[PDB]
Amino acid sequence: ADKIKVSLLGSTGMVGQKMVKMLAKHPYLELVKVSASPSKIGKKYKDAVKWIEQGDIPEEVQDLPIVSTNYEDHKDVDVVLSALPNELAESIELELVKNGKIVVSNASPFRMDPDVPLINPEINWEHLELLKFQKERKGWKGILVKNPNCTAAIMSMPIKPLIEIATKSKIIITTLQAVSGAGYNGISFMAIEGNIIPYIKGEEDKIAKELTKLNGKLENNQIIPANLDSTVTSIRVPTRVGHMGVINIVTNERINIEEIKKTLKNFKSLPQQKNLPTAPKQPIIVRDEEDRPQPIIDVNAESGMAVTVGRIRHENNVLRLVVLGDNLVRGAAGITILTVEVMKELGYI
Amino acid sequence: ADKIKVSLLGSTGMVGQKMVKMLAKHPYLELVKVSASPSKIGKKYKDAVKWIEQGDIPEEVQDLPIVSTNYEDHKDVDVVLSALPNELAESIELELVKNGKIVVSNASPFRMDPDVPLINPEINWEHLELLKFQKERKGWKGILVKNPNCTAAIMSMPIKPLIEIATKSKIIITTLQAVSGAGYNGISFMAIEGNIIPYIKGEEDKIAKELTKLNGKLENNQIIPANLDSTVTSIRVPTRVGHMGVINIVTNERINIEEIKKTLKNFKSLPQQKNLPTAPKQPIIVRDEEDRPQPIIDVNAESGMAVTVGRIRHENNVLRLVVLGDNLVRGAAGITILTVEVMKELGYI
Amino acid sequence: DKIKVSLLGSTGMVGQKMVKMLAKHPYLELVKVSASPSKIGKKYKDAVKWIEQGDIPEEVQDLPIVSTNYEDHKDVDVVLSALPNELAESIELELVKNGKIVVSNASPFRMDPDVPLINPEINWEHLELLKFQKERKGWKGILVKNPNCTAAIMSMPIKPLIEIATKSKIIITTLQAVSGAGYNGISFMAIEGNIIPYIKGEEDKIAKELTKLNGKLENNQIIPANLDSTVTSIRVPTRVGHMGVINIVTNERINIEEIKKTLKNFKSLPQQKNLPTAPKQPIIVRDEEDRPQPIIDVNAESGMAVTVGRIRHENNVLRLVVLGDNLVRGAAGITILTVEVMKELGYI
Amino acid sequence: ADKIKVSLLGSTGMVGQKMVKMLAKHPYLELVKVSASPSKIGKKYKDAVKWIEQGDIPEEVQDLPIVSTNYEDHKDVDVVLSALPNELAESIELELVKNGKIVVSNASPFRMDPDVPLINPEINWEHLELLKFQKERKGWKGILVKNPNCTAAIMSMPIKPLIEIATKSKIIITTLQAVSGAGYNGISFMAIEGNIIPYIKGEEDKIAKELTKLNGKLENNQIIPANLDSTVTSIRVPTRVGHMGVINIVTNERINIEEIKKTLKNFKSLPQQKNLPTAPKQPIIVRDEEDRPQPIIDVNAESGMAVTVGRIRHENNVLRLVVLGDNLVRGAAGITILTVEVMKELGYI
DSSP, X not given: OOOEEEEEESOSSHHHHHHHHHHTTOSSEEEEEEEOOGGGTTSBHHHHOOOOSSSSOOHHHHTOBEEXXXXXXXXXXXXXXXXXXXXXXXXXXXXXXXXXXXXXXXXXXXXXXXXXXXXXXXXXXXXXXXXXXXXXXXXXXXXXXXXXXXXXXXXXXXXXXXXXXXXXXXXXXXXXXXXXXXXXXXXXXXXXXXXXXXXOTTHHHHHHHHHHHHTOEEXXXXXXXXXOXXXXXXXXXXXXXXXXXXXXXXXXXXXXXXXXXXXXXXXXXXXXXXXXXXXXXXXXXXXXXXXXXXXXXXXXXXXXXXXXXXEEEEETTEEEEEEEEOTTTTTTHHHHHHHHHHHHHHTOO | OOOEEEEEETTTSHHHHHHHHHHTTOSXXXXXXXXXXXXXXXXXXXXXXXXXXXXXOOTTTTTOBEEOSSGGGTTTOSEEEEOOOHHHHHHHHHHHHHTTOEEEEOSSTTTTOTXXXXXXXXXXXXXXXXXXXXXXXXXXXXXXEEOOOHHHHHHHHHHGGGHHHHHTSEEEEEEEEOGGGGOSSSSBHHHHTTOOBXXXXXXXXXXXXXXXXXXXXXXXXXXXXXXXXXXXXXXXXXXXXXXXXXXXXXXXXXXXXXXXXHHHHTOOOHXXXXXXXXXXSXXXXXXXXXXXXXXXXXXXXXXXXXXXXXXXXXXXXXXXXXXXXXXXXXXXXXXXXXXHHHHHHTTOO | OOEEEEEETTTSHHHHHHHHHHTTOSSEEEEEEBOOGGGTTSBHHHHOOOOSSSOOOTTTTTOBOBOSSGGGGTTOSEEEEOOOHHHHHHHHXXXXXXXXXXXXXXXXXXXXXXXXXXXXXXXXXXXXXXXXXXXXXXXXSEXXXXXXXXXXXXXXXXXXXXXXXXXXXXXXXXXXXXXXXXXXXXXXXXXXXXXXXXXXXXXXXXXXXXXXXXXXXXXXXXXXXXXXXEEEEEEOSOSSOEEEEEEEEOSSOOOHHHHHHHHHTOOOHHXXXXXXXXXXXXXXXXXXXXXXXXXXXXXXXXXXXXXXXXEEEOSSEEEEEEEEOTTIIIIIHHHHHHHHHHHHHTOO | OOOEEEEEETTTSHHHHHXXXXXXXXXXXXXXXXXXXXXXXXSBHHHHOOOOSSSOOOTTTTTOBEEOSSGGGTTTOSEEEEOOOHHHHHHHHHHHXXXXXXXXXXXXXXXXXXXXXXXXXXXXXXXXXXXXXXXXXXXXXXXXXXXXXXXXXXXXXXXXXXXXXXXXXXXXXXXXXXXXXXXXXXXXHHHHTTOOBOXXXXXXXXXXXXXXHHTOEEETTEEEOOOOEEEEEEEEOSOSSOEEEEEEEEOOSOOOHHHHHHHHHTOOOHHHHTTOTTSOSOSEEEOOSTTOOOHHHHTTTTTTTSEEEEEEEEOSSEEEEEEEEOTTIIIIIXXXXXHHHHXXXXXXX
């Protein structure tokens, strides 16, 4: 196939290593440049990274030289992918886009910018149309696309196909997030093992707001935010990978429990239709067993691109369900790569 | 300092060992007999228990011989306390009550029986008055008093002083329950470490139903169930001790956070007033830091009898707060003993 | 040339491991699976609490559970056993007394003089004992044994160093994963954030079994290796992977680099004949001072290779840390490798 | 009680919070000043520390203002206690000592200095005599005493009473150390949970060498190192508090197994003889059960000041025993305080 040359910002972290691994064997996406901190620039990827993924560093990437995050080092790249930390992404990504680079990033800055698409492939690929007016609106020579917070990404999967119910209700959400969500070394053993921390800075606000844009509707070259009144409580649990979410759609709207299970299990979108390399066959898996989903059993579903839903139940004035997803793949690495695949498929390239 | 002689059924399990450790040093409750499995009867406590509590076995209980769960072995005790497993409690307990014994137990059978008080001291001590007509209603010679499910007991604490708002709203509760909740060896290491099991057999139904009785109002010898419409999701987490609850009261009622915090921090009842030995000075502790409560920090609050609440917040049509309590003490051992103390105080002796 | 086999104790962790491995084997065809009495007659998928990775191989999910009695294993070429130590003796003896070829990783008969205790790369030659077993035991069938999972792991590095390990005292400390006691053997409360410096009978099995594993086959029988070792076994909050600290007391000069070289270049029959379950390099050596580590190395070569690191020699003591997959190298894998070796040498 | 005013360097780390906790309630040791990093100086302890100990900050220390580590801020203390990290200790301590202060540190610098006593109270309080000549030998106006590596402190407990045998043999030791040994946030959850790291930078060398000095003999005002041929391997395990150790004494010497057990459990020294406040009545506890010692069961033995020994066995050419101690108390906080107690008792003040 005709290869599309890509570079990767923040390739040293957990999300970065996941992407490096997924790209090392990609059909047409050819990773030719990886970036990391300044002091590592010039060294080979294998000499700068502390491999945390499964197995050895791919040979196709181990010798890739570390380049800076500056425009000059990415001139020959077709698309720049970014996994930079939230506190460094704004300046870096802004300068690149100003210089004409096409940037697809999963870092938080700009995610809620009205002219920037926040993409989760299956959920709102149509929102990419915003790209048609971005250059003129921001006065950029480049292109910027964003991916949502990992938890938001996971939570949006079951909500979208049920957007009509969720829109007319009070959404209560409790999220149980794995330690890896804070990076590989973000949380100490002493602080979390055999424990629970009912607080994750800024996570609750990002979830509620981003969910509003992910489920929004495109009208007249703009995104009309979906009306979602959600209250969320994000908790950190002693889990390595996998974000769980207990969703309670408090509403008196009629609800056909079986039709809902059917709708979720049959949910397919453009990524599934065009059979994109990183698109899972069934983005949403429904489990009938009452003790599912569970991180150690379902986290890897379809390479971590599929979310698993269980305990779907309808009680008085409320539809409840439990969803699980790989925060590293579905929540970051995989959706960024899947976003690029979609863009190529739609001609934004 | 007159000693009231008591016996303990199911003294070998975690709840049992806790009560043994608590009774060993009680000011007036004298543990004189303990029961365990049949093959253990006749052996001294120390030779039949796999002690998992802190430090050595109390020297005032170690040599206590194990007796049977039959009437003849308890004719000489003032009160029969029981921490028997749910599946064996009904038949055993009923006979002791049918033969005239006063039985106070934390096992599930009879909890929702209209003529049996389901007590959590600070919450509904007044319900003990149901006993005035129990004998004639049941045709028993004895008296039976019950303590609720450990989780319900913990959840009911903050809900009581906020019963006015809880009655006029949809209550959504998600609970994170420690492994100890399933006994010392109920859950294997492989099944839970680094994992989450979004289900606990029968737990959710119990929580919802019992909260109704615990917050009910004793009116003319009958308990009027509190109108508490709640949907609960119980989850097992890799925690040793301490059940956490995320409570969302979705209503249109006015929500004053500073007022609610005052109400919760100043909550007190008969146990506190009378300074009963197992009563915490402050039954509800409120935390202002955003990362509280946490099991490893707060589960021991006031010897495990006080619950800890934090993250009290007000969002559109919803009051949210996080509560944590020691499931072995506040949730079982401590409330059974405290119940006996109240009974002594009110004259039921 | 297909070889039809059955599996006793196919429902436990080792059993499920073997099921996954056999489901896709070149010539070994799993035709029957056995489990406890109450499970007999049920389809495997309905009797087992699948705990392995992926789904249950479709060639096994619908296999109906059969008993452990001879009559149900008549049409089988070789009977593989992953039975628990407490039930194996009676069950296996009867099968063998009926003319069945039985290869098991259970402990009973491991130290029986006429029964080979095999760990492929270490002592495949010991399989010769089989040429005399029938008359020596008065059996119609055949019986082969695989060692204790920890012994199996500790033996890998000791073999190529047998000359020095022989003339010296050996001190061994082992840290064994929770799975070594099955999936539900140890509770969360008992081990999380903890260490239990004791595993019933483990230390005696390792010392004695290492003796036979490293023995010399002389004049139709095994000469136990003179391995004077004191071992202390400890249980740790790990899922899979048994670790070992091995100290051999030398009274000479040792070249660490040649030790590393000797270990990584270790090869044997299983490698020579490229058998399906034999790892290309049974012993992997790590130069980084913080290896091996269970989460990083436990899966080395599908779990058939052990990893050694921290190879040091000072104060007349050769010290090394080794790690092995207690479920594959420790059992499932070597039991299958053993059968492969048997087919390779003509015992079939 | 005759008061002794002290200050504590590194009051903020785990070991420091432990000491703060132990000194608040001390009979005659008055913690009058606490120190920490420069950016914390001038703030109240409660506002500068990330409290991680059980319960609340002692109110006798919560309002103490953080001072510097320089001499000017300690001119008024009788003794300066130090729990500073190994990498900063040397310069800071040397300067205090050079200015005439008496410093007792559990940090590694100067531990193996021949003119400086390395103390573990029971094992070698006698070595304190080195102080009578320390000024003449170092030129210092002050006084410096050191405490050993925590693992070495624990390991030296059982080796001392058995020094005659240990000296005529080859000692093989494998230590399994708790995560807290590397500080509260030294190791990440991802790196250690469900894992084992067979390496701890420089631990093995420290144990072997320090073991040599701890067990030495005082002769002609100096220390004759004990001839201890040790070969230690140190491993990191996923436990919170408590270092375990497998000690193998390879010797052909005749050994009476019951005499060893008798010798260990009966070990007592000056700290015990003088009934010092932080001295445990029984420095070494021996267990008969085959599955002991265990971190979660024994680490707290006598407020963490007593080590627990178990599995004592003599197979043939090897004396094997397993030992466990609290790395934070016996291994650091408790011995530093105990050391000061010994000094006061012997007239060093």
